[PDB]
Amino acid sequence: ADLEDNWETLNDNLKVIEKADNAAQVKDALTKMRAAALDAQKATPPKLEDKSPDSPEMKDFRHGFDILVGQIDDALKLANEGKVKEAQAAAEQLKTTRNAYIQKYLGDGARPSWVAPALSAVLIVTTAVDVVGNLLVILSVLRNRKLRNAGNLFLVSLALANLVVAFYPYPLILVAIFYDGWAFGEEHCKASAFVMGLSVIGSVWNITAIAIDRYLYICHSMAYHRIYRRWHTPLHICLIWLLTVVALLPNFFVGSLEYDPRIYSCTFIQTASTQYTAAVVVIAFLLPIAVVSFCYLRIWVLVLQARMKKYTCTVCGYIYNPEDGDPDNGVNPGTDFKDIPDDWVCPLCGVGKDQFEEVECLKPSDLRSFLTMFVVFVIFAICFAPLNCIGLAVAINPQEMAPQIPEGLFVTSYLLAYFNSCLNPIVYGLLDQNFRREYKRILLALWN
Ligand SMILES: COc1ccc2[nH]c(-c3ccccc3)c(CCNC(C)=O)c2c1
Numbered sequence: 001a002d003l004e005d006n007w008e009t010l011n012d013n014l015k016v017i018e019k020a021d022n023a024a025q026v027k028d029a030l031t032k033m034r035a036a037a038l039d040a041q042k043a044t045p046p047k048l049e050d051k052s053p054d055s056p057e058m059k060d061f062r063h064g065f066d067i068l069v070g071q072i073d074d075a076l077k078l079a080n081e082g083k084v085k086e087a088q089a090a091a092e093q094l095k096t097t098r099n100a101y102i103q104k105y106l107g108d109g110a111r112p113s114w115v116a117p118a119l120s121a122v123l124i125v126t127t128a129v130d131v132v133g134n135l136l137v138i139l140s141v142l143r144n145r146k147l148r149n150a151g152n153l154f155l156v157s158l159a160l161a162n163l164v165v166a167f168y169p170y171p172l173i174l175v176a177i178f179y180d181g182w183a184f185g186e187e188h189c190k191a192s193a194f195v196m197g198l199s200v201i202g203s204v205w206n207i208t209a210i211a212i213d214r215y216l217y218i219c220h221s222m223a224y225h226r227i228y229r230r231w232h233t234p235l236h237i238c239l240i241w242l243l244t245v246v247a248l249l250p251n252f253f254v255g256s257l258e259y260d261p262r263i264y265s266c267t268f269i270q271t272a273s274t275q276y277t278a279a280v281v282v283i284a285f286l287l288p289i290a291v292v293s294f295c296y297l298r299i300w301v302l303v304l305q306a307r308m309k310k311y312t313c314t315v316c317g318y319i320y321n322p323e324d325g326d327p328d329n330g331v332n333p334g335t336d337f338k339d340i341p342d343d344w345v346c347p348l349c350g351v352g353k354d355q356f357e358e359v360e361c362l363k364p365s366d367l368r369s370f371l372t373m374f375v376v377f378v379i380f381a382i383c384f385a386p387l388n389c390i391g392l393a394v395a396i397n398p399q400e401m402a403p404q405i406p407e408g409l410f411v412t413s414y415l416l417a418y419f420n421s422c423l424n425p426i427v428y429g430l431l432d433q434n435f436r437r438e439y440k441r442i443l444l445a446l447w448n
């Protein structure tokens with residue numbers, strides 16, 4: 001057999017022993033692993049190609065396999081006895097040592113010089129803005145009682161979803177750039193990769209639940225108010241997080257969470273299972289986008305048709321708000337001005353609904369901050385649109401599309417996706433007046 005193929009063969013068997021269900025499956029895979037490691041010991045590596053045989057260059061990697069095959073021999077002793085959990089454990093100890101004397105053997109891959117600084121600078125920016133920005137968001141929702149009440153409890157759920165990733169995966173990835181490889185165990189590999197899944201998927205579905213809430217608060221305002229919220233919203237916030245965990249469990253059976261040298265981060269592999277990947281691209285993207293687009297489309301047509309707009313009085317200045325109605329005069333909160341009967345008079349001066357001019361301005365803060373929550377979604381779709389397309393190309397034709405996906409393009413997609421984590425609070429401050437106010441209030445309180 002070859003040497004590069006010998007590296008690819010025993011590395012494939014290393015995935016089989018993991019997903020194996022019995023000791024005979026493990027024993028069989030360790031047989032194909034002992035012979036492949038021995039045939040690699042006969043071959044000459046590319047790094048010590050011009051070096052001498054007795055030299056600690058070619059004789060250096062010779063004892064590396066002696067440590068390896070000996071460890072396999074200890075691992076198949078357990079497998080022979082029937083101990084599957086014991087033999088699979090010793091195989092992970094075979095994995096940690098093998099990676100420490102494999103990077104010393106060959107260097108096939110070639111990362112373009114710009115990935116290391118780009119990725120790291122992006123990560124540094126994102127982590128710094130994510131930790132500060134989404135923390136202010138949490139504090140402002142938790143301190144402001146009127147703000148939190150306006151279905152903005154989902155914003156906390158989303159802020160933590162952004163936050164968690166800045167605290168565990170993002171800093172580890174930055175160590176993996178500076179050390180040119182995964183400096184942590186297989187333990188921290190799949191764990192960091194899993195935290196990323198929760199973040200990315202949890203964010204889509206949180207954005208989805210906000211899209212539904214604002215659809216039902218503007219278009220079904222009457223029926224909406226009939227339906228409680230008190231114990232409702234914490235239940236859906238919990239439910240969406242459990243739905244996410246479930247969506248992420250096939251990764252442990254399909255083995256799609258390993259280190260990606262292209263993006264220097266231990267993440268989800270599109271090739272590992274094209275079926276699961278295809279599902280991930282629908283369930284965690286195409287489907288929420290499809291349902292969220294319907295929701296904001298139905299809002300924008302109502303905003304276009306002049307419905308759910310404020311009507312300011314020409315005489316005393318009283319402003320009608322469809323969100324509040326005029327309940328003491330028999331008009332319920334959620335009733336549009338166009339819907340109040342012609343006999344209605346101003347609750348402050350007494351002039352009829354004939355001398356009431358509408359507010360032409362459709363400010364972001366209006367209708368529970370609908371158009372700013374909209375922007376948040378658009379930005380999400382922009383950042384995650386390329387990667388999900390790359391995932392879609394691979395899920396369909398891996399034989400023709402997968403080797404035709406440029407490395408330089410794949411990095412650009414993960415760069416955008418990583419950048420999303422810090423952006424959400426910035427958009428709140430630029431459009432939403434109340435958040436901006438609260439951001440200022442916190443900073444002012446911190447300097448006094
Ligand atoms: C469901 O299993 C997981 C598990 C871990 C994952 N981590 C990421 C990800 C994190 C940051 C930036 C971009 C992608 C995805 C999203 C991966 N989506 C695609 C289409 O490849 C992910 C998925």
Ligand SMILES: [Zn+2]
Nearest residue numbers: 313316346349
């Ligand atoms: Zn008036």
